[PDB]
DNA sequence: ATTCGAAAATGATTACATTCGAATCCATTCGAAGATTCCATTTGAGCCTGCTCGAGCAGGCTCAAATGGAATCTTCGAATGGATTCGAATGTAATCATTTTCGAATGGATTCGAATGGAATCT
DNA sequence: GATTCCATTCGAATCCATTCGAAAATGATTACATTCGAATCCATTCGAAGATTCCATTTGAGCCTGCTCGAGCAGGCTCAAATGGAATCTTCGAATGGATTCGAATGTAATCATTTTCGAATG
């Protein structure tokens, strides 16, 4: 598929459709904007998940819980600046 | 004790009562989902904890360990509230 | 529609032994949607400022530069450029 | 008299989670006032949202949208 | 294009003997554009939330209620409702 | 015209065109959304201008300047809450 | 070039803020905070300039950057 | 000839009534160009760009000094100290 | 781990938007002069800040009693949510008939000046 | 009672705002074509009022003791004043560069009709 051509796990067609559905006036969206966006989203997801999993394994526990996510986000300066939301259960 | 936990520090029945009484001013005969009240409680506790952190900073600035209403007022004024 | 499939695939890529609950999965869904809306809005504004109609990867790159901090932006730009280059060839 | 259900122990716990060592005896009334103001703002916005949709029930997404409007995003209840 | 014609009309309505400078005119144009962009964006979001496509005066009224401080939103709502009623009467 | 039919000074057709130009996807805009929006813009303009003209008259001058706009905005709680922007040419409100 | 923002100028900026007395260590702090703010805004302005394939920084780039920073300004085209 | 605190109040009255710019223009222009040379080389600036930058900078500094004065009064002083700037910036969200 | 309505991918086809060269022509940069005006340095002084110490205040912890919250059915009628027209309203397509925007021109409004008669400060 | 600052008071050239003109957008009208938002009807949830507890949290009272506050010095550090001395600012003039417009010429995104797979609800 398009995701396998780009070498990603996130969907390119669905993200392209969403991008088209969120453009003002009579605008158009290229096929490489979707590839760029899928790459960015996958990268950020992997970063957050990696930090949270390291925090979880520091507790000798397999599963990731919202507390692990909050510990990972608040312990990182970049992820702290980017994510200012309140995590329910963390 | 309360720094390292994740629970909610307010009882749920009084908070729900207060939320409904406040909402009575905007529209009579209002129903609520339980998730709406739970979200309101989470946000409220987060807000109060952050404000208390700012208040402690203000208390330390004046060479005290006890927090006073003036610290809350200064913190809220600098925040633009 | 959700991102649970792809979040799970990425997690299996990163930590092949750890799992994830459902509350954490919902939080990750919220995070992904938040970032997507931010990037889309910035790109649309950028296209409007230049008096252009199409949204391209230049708009996405500029939005990522404007929204992400520090080294996050650099590594994200590298990943996106690599993905586009691998796609077009 | 529903704001007197926010008791001294609860305010003390919320202050302890913020790193506070000692509390003055006049802090509880101030805390009740500020909580009332915050709740009034958020609930006003949420009721606006539920009135637009022609509903009689306040949902969690109305609260999420209202909080996002105030600049206080919240993860874990939808969105 | 700008808003100077209508701003001057309103000024001559409220203060018949008072003029205005060019810097003040620029500031007034910036103010009008700012508020218009805010209202338009919020109305678009409201239309999206309800799975709708058309933007009506209901979206505008809800946007006005959400964006303006109280005792300022009430008079704005009254003025808009009066204008729409007078327009539809003809 | 539409503005005279509604009883306004601001343009209904131009504002309708702009509203159409800033809608996401394939969005339609009604003819009364423009009337409502023009009424709102005219109301806010009139409030700001009336306060600024009062400030100008108190200072014994004819014209309005950015100083008078700043004095009018900062002296009103609602306008201060709504307009958080920086005005290039009017500095501050004299305090202690 | 940060020392070209003199101490009389900072005194004037403090007087417009209502400040009566000033410590002697306030000027270096003020220079640091001004440098941080200016770098933050100029980064975004140059990003906007580079997107448009231009070599000149215009006032609209500055206005957009300030609006992104949350520091809207009136009187320079928006 | 004048007690310490008289001329200070006179200048407080003076600069809270005027509307001009309180920083010289050539030094600010030089500083802006020197800062911008770290992002792209051979850049050009409109005069309006530098003027807008100066207006925004002065507004920012005056607001910061107002917050700093509040902090100084909180601690029962009239002199402003760097700790007040730090506290105001930390509560604001910058530090 | 299964089925499957749902949606993405394939293959042309146009128009449509974007890209490539000129051609100005604004406007940014650069160099020069100089006269005042801001700034820098020192000085002398007074007021404000910081430290100590005692004096008054009031917060935390303990305990016995009282009280209100949480938790799990039960139900039941209220209230969203989905279907099918359907009737209200928006957009597209030409044709005018304004209307607004870009030029120039003199009435008031603003600005700069020495002059002079008043609040304001030390003494 | 002798400075120094404010606070009008009258004089005029200048800068600027407010009227006038011509011409290219651009609303407003008329007439379809057709989406899209409403109105009734029927399902399914879901929220609210009730009941009954053990129990876990909250409430005074008080007592100790730690903390904040007020008063008096000491010093040290910021302010006000005067005198040189750099240097900004205004105006001037050329020279240089690069943003915008405008034709031509490609690059490509959206809309069809088939085909296939894939994500979501259910186990």
mmCIF file of C-alpha atoms (C1' of nucleotides) in Angstrom, chain I, chain J:
data_model
loop_
_atom_site.group_PDB
_atom_site.id
_atom_site.type_symbol
_atom_site.label_atom_id
_atom_site.label_comp_id
_atom_site.label_asym_id
_atom_site.label_seq_id
_atom_site.Cartn_x
_atom_site.Cartn_y
_atom_site.Cartn_z
ATOM 1 C "C1'" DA I 1 -9.756 -15.249 15.750
ATOM 2 C "C1'" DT I 2 -13.985 -14.217 11.654
ATOM 3 C "C1'" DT I 3 -17.013 -11.544 8.386
ATOM 4 C "C1'" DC I 4 -17.777 -8.154 6.231
ATOM 5 C "C1'" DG I 5 -19.701 -3.269 4.620
ATOM 6 C "C1'" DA I 6 -16.621 -0.033 4.081
ATOM 7 C "C1'" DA I 7 -12.965 2.212 1.971
ATOM 8 C "C1'" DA I 8 -8.566 2.379 -0.425
ATOM 9 C "C1'" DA I 9 -5.901 1.395 -4.902
ATOM 10 C "C1'" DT I 10 -5.680 1.022 -10.117
ATOM 11 C "C1'" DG I 11 -5.818 3.609 -14.954
ATOM 12 C "C1'" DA I 12 -7.078 7.673 -17.774
ATOM 13 C "C1'" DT I 13 -8.419 12.438 -18.512
ATOM 14 C "C1'" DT I 14 -8.685 16.829 -18.234
ATOM 15 C "C1'" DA I 15 -8.392 21.331 -16.579
ATOM 16 C "C1'" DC I 16 -6.202 23.785 -13.205
ATOM 17 C "C1'" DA I 17 -2.711 25.375 -10.491
ATOM 18 C "C1'" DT I 18 2.093 25.990 -10.216
ATOM 19 C "C1'" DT I 19 6.756 26.865 -12.292
ATOM 20 C "C1'" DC I 20 10.291 29.301 -15.686
ATOM 21 C "C1'" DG I 21 12.011 33.421 -17.712
ATOM 22 C "C1'" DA I 22 12.221 38.464 -18.335
ATOM 23 C "C1'" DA I 23 11.301 43.581 -17.031
ATOM 24 C "C1'" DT I 24 10.964 46.935 -14.365
ATOM 25 C "C1'" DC I 25 11.003 49.955 -10.458
ATOM 26 C "C1'" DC I 26 10.511 50.385 -5.530
ATOM 27 C "C1'" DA I 27 13.097 50.494 -1.701
ATOM 28 C "C1'" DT I 28 16.929 48.781 0.924
ATOM 29 C "C1'" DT I 29 21.785 49.687 1.609
ATOM 30 C "C1'" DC I 30 25.839 52.716 1.927
ATOM 31 C "C1'" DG I 31 28.537 56.782 2.630
ATOM 32 C "C1'" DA I 32 28.968 61.716 4.562
ATOM 33 C "C1'" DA I 33 28.278 65.853 7.687
ATOM 34 C "C1'" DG I 34 27.552 67.937 11.901
ATOM 35 C "C1'" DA I 35 25.440 70.086 16.007
ATOM 36 C "C1'" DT I 36 23.178 69.184 19.781
ATOM 37 C "C1'" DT I 37 21.822 65.874 23.048
ATOM 38 C "C1'" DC I 38 21.866 62.026 25.332
ATOM 39 C "C1'" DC I 39 25.051 59.209 28.113
ATOM 40 C "C1'" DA I 40 28.973 58.209 31.357
ATOM 41 C "C1'" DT I 41 31.675 59.191 35.572
ATOM 42 C "C1'" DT I 42 32.323 60.929 40.018
ATOM 43 C "C1'" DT I 43 30.635 62.583 44.342
ATOM 44 C "C1'" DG I 44 28.286 63.477 48.359
ATOM 45 C "C1'" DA I 45 24.467 62.178 51.090
ATOM 46 C "C1'" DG I 46 20.411 60.230 53.132
ATOM 47 C "C1'" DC I 47 17.096 56.624 53.316
ATOM 48 C "C1'" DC I 48 16.054 51.971 52.902
ATOM 49 C "C1'" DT I 49 17.121 47.110 53.749
ATOM 50 C "C1'" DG I 50 18.730 43.455 56.581
ATOM 51 C "C1'" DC I 51 19.759 41.287 61.165
ATOM 52 C "C1'" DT I 52 18.933 40.359 66.109
ATOM 53 C "C1'" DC I 53 16.080 39.697 69.919
ATOM 54 C "C1'" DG I 54 12.147 39.275 72.394
ATOM 55 C "C1'" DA I 55 6.855 38.948 72.299
ATOM 56 C "C1'" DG I 56 2.666 37.432 70.764
ATOM 57 C "C1'" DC I 57 0.185 34.233 67.880
ATOM 58 C "C1'" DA I 58 -1.737 30.200 65.924
ATOM 59 C "C1'" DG I 59 -0.918 25.602 63.337
ATOM 60 C "C1'" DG I 60 -0.311 20.476 63.748
ATOM 61 C "C1'" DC I 61 -1.332 16.402 66.088
ATOM 62 C "C1'" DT I 62 -4.155 13.333 69.233
ATOM 63 C "C1'" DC I 63 -8.511 11.331 70.495
ATOM 64 C "C1'" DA I 64 -13.180 10.366 71.132
ATOM 65 C "C1'" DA I 65 -17.665 10.854 68.908
ATOM 66 C "C1'" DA I 66 -20.677 11.670 65.073
ATOM 67 C "C1'" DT I 67 -21.750 11.698 60.517
ATOM 68 C "C1'" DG I 68 -22.074 11.202 55.782
ATOM 69 C "C1'" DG I 69 -20.284 8.785 51.730
ATOM 70 C "C1'" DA I 70 -19.676 4.413 48.411
ATOM 71 C "C1'" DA I 71 -21.682 0.770 46.408
ATOM 72 C "C1'" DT I 72 -24.904 -2.490 44.354
ATOM 73 C "C1'" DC I 73 -29.318 -3.641 42.318
ATOM 74 C "C1'" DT I 74 -34.350 -1.982 40.663
ATOM 75 C "C1'" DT I 75 -36.834 0.233 37.699
ATOM 76 C "C1'" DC I 76 -38.964 3.464 35.045
ATOM 77 C "C1'" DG I 77 -40.125 6.695 32.216
ATOM 78 C "C1'" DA I 78 -37.116 10.462 29.711
ATOM 79 C "C1'" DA I 79 -34.320 11.220 26.072
ATOM 80 C "C1'" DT I 80 -31.144 10.530 22.421
ATOM 81 C "C1'" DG I 81 -30.492 8.191 18.015
ATOM 82 C "C1'" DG I 82 -31.790 6.262 13.361
ATOM 83 C "C1'" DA I 83 -35.239 6.269 8.675
ATOM 84 C "C1'" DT I 84 -37.861 8.434 5.081
ATOM 85 C "C1'" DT I 85 -39.572 11.790 2.873
ATOM 86 C "C1'" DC I 86 -39.977 16.705 2.266
ATOM 87 C "C1'" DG I 87 -40.194 21.215 1.920
ATOM 88 C "C1'" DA I 88 -36.881 25.290 2.707
ATOM 89 C "C1'" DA I 89 -32.924 27.376 0.807
ATOM 90 C "C1'" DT I 90 -28.282 27.686 -1.349
ATOM 91 C "C1'" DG I 91 -25.494 27.884 -5.400
ATOM 92 C "C1'" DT I 92 -24.717 28.468 -10.348
ATOM 93 C "C1'" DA I 93 -25.224 31.496 -14.736
ATOM 94 C "C1'" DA I 94 -25.716 36.434 -17.261
ATOM 95 C "C1'" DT I 95 -26.683 41.166 -17.110
ATOM 96 C "C1'" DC I 96 -26.379 45.374 -15.701
ATOM 97 C "C1'" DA I 97 -25.958 49.412 -12.290
ATOM 98 C "C1'" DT I 98 -23.850 50.776 -8.460
ATOM 99 C "C1'" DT I 99 -19.919 51.260 -5.411
ATOM 100 C "C1'" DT I 100 -15.661 51.610 -3.798
ATOM 101 C "C1'" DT I 101 -10.774 52.601 -4.581
ATOM 102 C "C1'" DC I 102 -7.195 55.096 -6.315
ATOM 103 C "C1'" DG I 103 -5.747 60.477 -7.830
ATOM 104 C "C1'" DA I 104 -5.679 65.582 -6.470
ATOM 105 C "C1'" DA I 105 -6.888 69.779 -3.762
ATOM 106 C "C1'" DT I 106 -7.932 74.078 0.746
ATOM 107 C "C1'" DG I 107 -10.621 73.893 5.704
ATOM 108 C "C1'" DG I 108 -9.667 73.022 10.192
ATOM 109 C "C1'" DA I 109 -6.706 70.715 13.368
ATOM 110 C "C1'" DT I 110 -2.135 70.140 15.252
ATOM 111 C "C1'" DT I 111 2.568 71.825 16.526
ATOM 112 C "C1'" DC I 112 6.436 74.830 18.029
ATOM 113 C "C1'" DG I 113 7.555 79.153 20.287
ATOM 114 C "C1'" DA I 114 9.123 82.084 24.136
ATOM 115 C "C1'" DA I 115 5.862 84.723 28.065
ATOM 116 C "C1'" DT I 116 3.702 84.731 32.057
ATOM 117 C "C1'" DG I 117 1.434 83.820 36.239
ATOM 118 C "C1'" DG I 118 0.498 79.630 39.536
ATOM 119 C "C1'" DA I 119 0.901 74.650 42.615
ATOM 120 C "C1'" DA I 120 4.991 72.263 44.645
ATOM 121 C "C1'" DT I 121 9.423 71.731 47.533
ATOM 122 C "C1'" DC I 122 12.974 72.657 50.729
ATOM 123 C "C1'" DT I 123 14.714 75.756 53.903
ATOM 124 C "C1'" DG J 1 10.367 82.865 51.001
ATOM 125 C "C1'" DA J 2 13.878 81.938 46.851
ATOM 126 C "C1'" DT J 3 14.364 77.794 42.987
ATOM 127 C "C1'" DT J 4 12.381 74.663 39.504
ATOM 128 C "C1'" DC J 5 8.583 72.986 37.620
ATOM 129 C "C1'" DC J 6 3.836 72.839 35.702
ATOM 130 C "C1'" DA J 7 -0.210 75.266 33.208
ATOM 131 C "C1'" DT J 8 -2.152 78.127 30.375
ATOM 132 C "C1'" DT J 9 -2.000 82.025 26.647
ATOM 133 C "C1'" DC J 10 -1.520 84.076 22.195
ATOM 134 C "C1'" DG J 11 1.011 83.750 17.188
ATOM 135 C "C1'" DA J 12 1.456 81.568 12.732
ATOM 136 C "C1'" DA J 13 3.264 78.061 8.973
ATOM 137 C "C1'" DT J 14 2.607 73.404 8.274
ATOM 138 C "C1'" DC J 15 0.878 68.865 8.090
ATOM 139 C "C1'" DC J 16 -3.270 66.468 7.440
ATOM 140 C "C1'" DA J 17 -7.922 65.283 7.053
ATOM 141 C "C1'" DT J 18 -12.027 65.641 4.319
ATOM 142 C "C1'" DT J 19 -14.202 66.521 -0.125
ATOM 143 C "C1'" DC J 20 -14.260 66.088 -5.225
ATOM 144 C "C1'" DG J 21 -13.492 62.367 -10.255
ATOM 145 C "C1'" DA J 22 -12.797 58.231 -13.280
ATOM 146 C "C1'" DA J 23 -12.957 53.440 -13.940
ATOM 147 C "C1'" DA J 24 -12.703 48.541 -12.858
ATOM 148 C "C1'" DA J 25 -14.688 45.094 -9.501
ATOM 149 C "C1'" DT J 26 -18.888 43.405 -7.764
ATOM 150 C "C1'" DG J 27 -23.427 43.068 -5.675
ATOM 151 C "C1'" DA J 28 -28.450 42.499 -6.849
ATOM 152 C "C1'" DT J 29 -32.002 40.440 -9.835
ATOM 153 C "C1'" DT J 30 -34.236 36.314 -12.289
ATOM 154 C "C1'" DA J 31 -34.468 31.492 -12.986
ATOM 155 C "C1'" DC J 32 -33.742 26.739 -12.217
ATOM 156 C "C1'" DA J 33 -31.279 22.239 -10.015
ATOM 157 C "C1'" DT J 34 -30.514 20.097 -6.149
ATOM 158 C "C1'" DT J 35 -28.437 19.341 -2.043
ATOM 159 C "C1'" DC J 36 -29.086 19.831 3.003
ATOM 160 C "C1'" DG J 37 -31.611 20.559 7.163
ATOM 161 C "C1'" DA J 38 -36.585 19.302 9.586
ATOM 162 C "C1'" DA J 39 -40.606 16.617 10.993
ATOM 163 C "C1'" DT J 40 -42.771 12.630 12.302
ATOM 164 C "C1'" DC J 41 -42.328 7.980 13.950
ATOM 165 C "C1'" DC J 42 -40.211 4.122 16.295
ATOM 166 C "C1'" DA J 43 -36.480 1.713 18.958
ATOM 167 C "C1'" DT J 44 -32.747 1.457 22.653
ATOM 168 C "C1'" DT J 45 -30.118 3.193 26.045
ATOM 169 C "C1'" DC J 46 -28.965 5.988 30.004
ATOM 170 C "C1'" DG J 47 -29.841 8.855 33.863
ATOM 171 C "C1'" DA J 48 -32.412 9.595 38.335
ATOM 172 C "C1'" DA J 49 -34.802 8.337 42.654
ATOM 173 C "C1'" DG J 50 -34.781 4.672 46.277
ATOM 174 C "C1'" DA J 51 -32.903 1.624 49.915
ATOM 175 C "C1'" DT J 52 -29.588 -0.234 53.138
ATOM 176 C "C1'" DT J 53 -25.974 -0.491 55.447
ATOM 177 C "C1'" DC J 54 -20.661 -1.202 57.761
ATOM 178 C "C1'" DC J 55 -17.293 1.848 57.585
ATOM 179 C "C1'" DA J 56 -14.165 5.388 56.720
ATOM 180 C "C1'" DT J 57 -13.920 10.226 56.913
ATOM 181 C "C1'" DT J 58 -14.887 14.612 59.375
ATOM 182 C "C1'" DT J 59 -15.430 17.628 63.853
ATOM 183 C "C1'" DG J 60 -14.425 19.933 68.166
ATOM 184 C "C1'" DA J 61 -11.181 20.809 71.990
ATOM 185 C "C1'" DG J 62 -6.912 21.594 73.600
ATOM 186 C "C1'" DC J 63 -2.106 21.855 74.339
ATOM 187 C "C1'" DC J 64 2.573 22.497 72.875
ATOM 188 C "C1'" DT J 65 5.545 24.528 70.467
ATOM 189 C "C1'" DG J 66 7.185 26.427 66.478
ATOM 190 C "C1'" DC J 67 6.538 30.474 63.690
ATOM 191 C "C1'" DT J 68 5.654 35.148 62.498
ATOM 192 C "C1'" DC J 69 5.695 39.868 63.832
ATOM 193 C "C1'" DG J 70 7.381 44.260 65.702
ATOM 194 C "C1'" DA J 71 11.279 47.504 67.386
ATOM 195 C "C1'" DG J 72 15.925 49.258 67.152
ATOM 196 C "C1'" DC J 73 20.460 49.856 64.935
ATOM 197 C "C1'" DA J 74 23.978 49.678 61.456
ATOM 198 C "C1'" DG J 75 25.537 50.067 57.159
ATOM 199 C "C1'" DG J 76 25.428 50.122 52.397
ATOM 200 C "C1'" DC J 77 23.637 51.257 48.446
ATOM 201 C "C1'" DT J 78 20.672 53.925 45.417
ATOM 202 C "C1'" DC J 79 19.680 58.722 44.099
ATOM 203 C "C1'" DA J 80 20.429 63.481 42.639
ATOM 204 C "C1'" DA J 81 23.765 66.958 40.474
ATOM 205 C "C1'" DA J 82 27.391 68.546 37.469
ATOM 206 C "C1'" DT J 83 30.725 68.087 33.729
ATOM 207 C "C1'" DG J 84 32.873 66.266 29.793
ATOM 208 C "C1'" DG J 85 32.453 63.261 25.752
ATOM 209 C "C1'" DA J 86 30.708 60.011 22.426
ATOM 210 C "C1'" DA J 87 26.995 59.153 19.056
ATOM 211 C "C1'" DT J 88 22.262 59.139 17.645
ATOM 212 C "C1'" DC J 89 19.363 61.524 14.178
ATOM 213 C "C1'" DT J 90 18.081 64.173 10.387
ATOM 214 C "C1'" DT J 91 18.985 65.097 5.620
ATOM 215 C "C1'" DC J 92 21.396 64.073 1.258
ATOM 216 C "C1'" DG J 93 22.550 61.537 -2.420
ATOM 217 C "C1'" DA J 94 23.712 57.597 -5.432
ATOM 218 C "C1'" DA J 95 23.965 52.754 -6.242
ATOM 219 C "C1'" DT J 96 22.261 48.097 -5.799
ATOM 220 C "C1'" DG J 97 19.195 44.324 -5.315
ATOM 221 C "C1'" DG J 98 15.108 41.703 -5.425
ATOM 222 C "C1'" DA J 99 9.866 41.606 -5.066
ATOM 223 C "C1'" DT J 100 5.981 41.699 -8.202
ATOM 224 C "C1'" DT J 101 3.696 41.207 -12.599
ATOM 225 C "C1'" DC J 102 2.908 38.912 -16.849
ATOM 226 C "C1'" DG J 103 2.921 35.547 -20.354
ATOM 227 C "C1'" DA J 104 3.967 30.466 -21.787
ATOM 228 C "C1'" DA J 105 4.659 25.716 -20.426
ATOM 229 C "C1'" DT J 106 4.379 21.924 -17.685
ATOM 230 C "C1'" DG J 107 3.064 18.839 -13.157
ATOM 231 C "C1'" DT J 108 -0.548 17.086 -10.963
ATOM 232 C "C1'" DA J 109 -4.814 16.474 -8.242
ATOM 233 C "C1'" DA J 110 -9.683 15.233 -8.431
ATOM 234 C "C1'" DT J 111 -13.403 12.445 -10.502
ATOM 235 C "C1'" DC J 112 -15.003 8.677 -12.574
ATOM 236 C "C1'" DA J 113 -15.765 2.675 -12.853
ATOM 237 C "C1'" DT J 114 -13.792 -1.841 -11.078
ATOM 238 C "C1'" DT J 115 -11.344 -4.644 -7.746
ATOM 239 C "C1'" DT J 116 -9.562 -5.767 -3.610
ATOM 240 C "C1'" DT J 117 -8.392 -5.483 0.985
ATOM 241 C "C1'" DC J 118 -8.631 -3.792 5.549
ATOM 242 C "C1'" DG J 119 -10.308 -2.156 10.004
ATOM 243 C "C1'" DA J 120 -14.254 -2.687 13.371
ATOM 244 C "C1'" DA J 121 -17.582 -5.187 15.809
ATOM 245 C "C1'" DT J 122 -18.216 -9.598 17.615
ATOM 246 C "C1'" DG J 123 -16.400 -13.589 19.959
#
